[PDB]
Amino acid sequence: TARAVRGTKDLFGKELRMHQRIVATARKVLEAAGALELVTPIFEETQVFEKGVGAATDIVRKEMFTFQDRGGRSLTLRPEGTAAMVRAYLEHGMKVWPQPVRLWMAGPMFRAERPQKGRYRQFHQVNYEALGSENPILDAEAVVLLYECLKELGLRRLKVKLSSVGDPEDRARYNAYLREVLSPHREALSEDSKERLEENPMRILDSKSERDQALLKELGVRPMLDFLGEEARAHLKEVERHLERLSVPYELEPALVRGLDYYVRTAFEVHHEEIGAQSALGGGGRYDGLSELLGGPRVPGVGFAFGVERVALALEAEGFGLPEEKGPDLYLIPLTEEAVAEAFYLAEALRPRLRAEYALAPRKPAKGLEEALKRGAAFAGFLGEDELRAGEVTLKRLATGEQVRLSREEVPGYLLQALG
């Protein structure tokens, strides 16, 4: 009856392997930059995400799998990694390690989204974090690291986008501006936008429908860029200076509305055309003050995260494939009932240095050979009356059909030299 809940799926085969390659590469680039692997629990106290992600965001308000612990306490399935990372930083007194502290991890993230496929309720992302410093070098580094993780995978058609949200103060003033300009024209907004006009009006910029877009155009709504505090623009220029020097091709966006509310200053995203909507492979930005929201001291930080599934799609789009699932080095086929157990014993003597499998029931040579082929085995191994009594095994390389009869002892060596 039961199936895997919509939005989640079993990972195996080529799909699983691609994910592993992706995380493997991310591990290499991130750790070369000094990042330490830190894996946080699957769930945190619901407050870590409420306060952290901001009580006004879609995620917190209606997209988190939150439940209650038997007796008391509210727990929530991690929807994103940054807040948890900061929570960990705080808890482990990382403030005392030599700064900045770079952390990275790869794991599942959960988001309660309205059922109708949509996309994913359980997805996986690589998360990088640089904590303990306001230096714009880290922002540039974070952007380069994300860019390189994808670049190393073989992706070529990426679109880096950079911008800034100024600071909570600048963010506030821009919102006020939006209300003042939009409210008297409130009646020309999409129902969706009319709600967004209440909390975090900026979203109305990144909304769909023609109603909104045409209005914004005629009203001459000015870009979030025009509201950056000077220190903010100084910082952003430093980041651009570094990226240009590192030759990272980017485009400065008029405004980058990120789905989380802890962002301050730098904000970036890397896209890929070949995905359709949800072209974002990953993104990130600075988030000083988040630690304070979780009740800690001031701890500056920048980082990014990217969706493994998204990256996989991008790879597929660029024609990157994976080679066929390897079969067993040897597949033992018993010719008599007594032989089935002997095949098992022989297989055990060969493992784990050699991948040896066997049939659990006797069968004709041709049939068992058919099954060995069916399993992609390199060698077929026959165990009938003769070899059982002689303490030998009849091996047959399936590719050429070449056959060899040798003692059980030589088998490991013969196979290893013939395949290694």
Give the binding site for ligand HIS (CB under 6 A).
Answer: 80-82, 127, 129, 260, 283-285, 287, 303-305
Residues 179-208 that bind a copy of itself (CB under 8 A): none
Interface mask toward a copy of itself for 150-179; x: CB under 8 A: --x---------------------------
Between 75 and 158, name the residue whose CB sits nearer to a copy of itself.
75
**Residues preceding discontinuities in the chain at C–N > 2.5 Å?**
none
Which region, judged by CB under 8 A, interacts with a copy of itself, from 136-144, 175-183, 304-312, 388-396? 136-144
Indicate whether 251 belongs to the interface with a copy of itself (CB under 8 A): no
Among 58, 95, 135, 161, binds a copy of itself (CB under 8 A): 135
Among 21, 22, 79, 87, binds a copy of itself (CB under 8 A): 87
Indicate whether 61 belongs to the interface with a copy of itself (CB under 8 A): no
Indicate whether 242 belongs to the interface with a copy of itself (CB under 8 A): yes
Closest to 378 (Cα-Cα) out of 300, 324, 312: 324
The listed partner (ligand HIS, a copy of itself, none) that binds 82, CB under 5 to 8 Å by sort, is ligand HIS
CA 345 to chain centre: 42
Indicate whether 11 belongs to the interface with a copy of itself (CB under 8 A): yes
Between 148 and 309, name the residue whose CB sits nearer to a copy of itself.
148
Treating both helix axes as pointing N-terminal to C-terminal, what angle do 46-53 and 82-91 enclose, rounded to 10 degrees? 110
Phi, psi of 382 (to 5 degrees): -100, 135
Smallest separation (angstroms) from ligand HIS to the CB of 369: 32
User: Are the beta carbons of 181 and 216 closer than 8 angstroms?
Assistant: no
The listed partner (a copy of itself, ligand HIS, none) that binds 344, CB under 5 to 8 Å by sort, is a copy of itself
Strands of the sheet with 250-252, listed across from one edge: 101-110, 122-131, 301-307, 280-286, 266-271, 159-164, 250-252
Which region, judged by CB under 8 A, interacts with a copy of itself, from 249-257, 258-266, 347-355, 379-387? 347-355
Smallest separation (angstroms) from ligand HIS to the CB of 82: 4
Smallest separation (angstroms) from ligand HIS to the CB of 166: 16
* Spatial separation of the C-alpha atoms in residues 43 and 61, rounded to whole Å: 17
Indicate whether 353 belongs to the interface with a copy of itself (CB under 8 A): yes
Residue type, 22: I
* Spatial separation of the C-alpha atoms in residues 165 and 306, rounded to whole Å: 20
Strands of the sheet with 66-68, listed across from one edge: 43-45, 74-77, 66-68
* Spatial separation of the C-alpha atoms in residues 223 and 177, rounded to whole Å: 11
The listed partner (a copy of itself, ligand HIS, none) that binds 117, CB under 5 to 8 Å by sort, is none
Residue found by looking up tokens 């990088």 in the block? 128
Smallest separation (angstroms) from a copy of itself to the CB of 173: 29
* CB neighbour list of residue 113: distance below 8 Å, 6 or more residues apart: 7, 63, 119, 120, 121
Give whole-number Cα distances, 67 to 41, 64, 77, 239, 343, in Å.
Answer: 15, 9, 8, 41, 51
Between 145 and 189, name the residue whose CB sits nearer to ligand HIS.
145
Indicate whether 355 belongs to the interface with a copy of itself (CB under 8 A): yes
Between 46 and 127, name the residue whose CB sits nearer to ligand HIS.
127
Among 14, 28, 186, 298, binds a copy of itself (CB under 8 A): 28
User: Are the beta carbons of 126 and 26 closer than 8 angstroms?
Assistant: yes
The listed partner (ligand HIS, a copy of itself, none) that binds 185, CB under 5 to 8 Å by sort, is none
Between 283 and 300, name the residue whose CB sits nearer to ligand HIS.
283
Q: Is the peptide bond before 352 cis (omega within 30 degrees of 0)?
A: yes
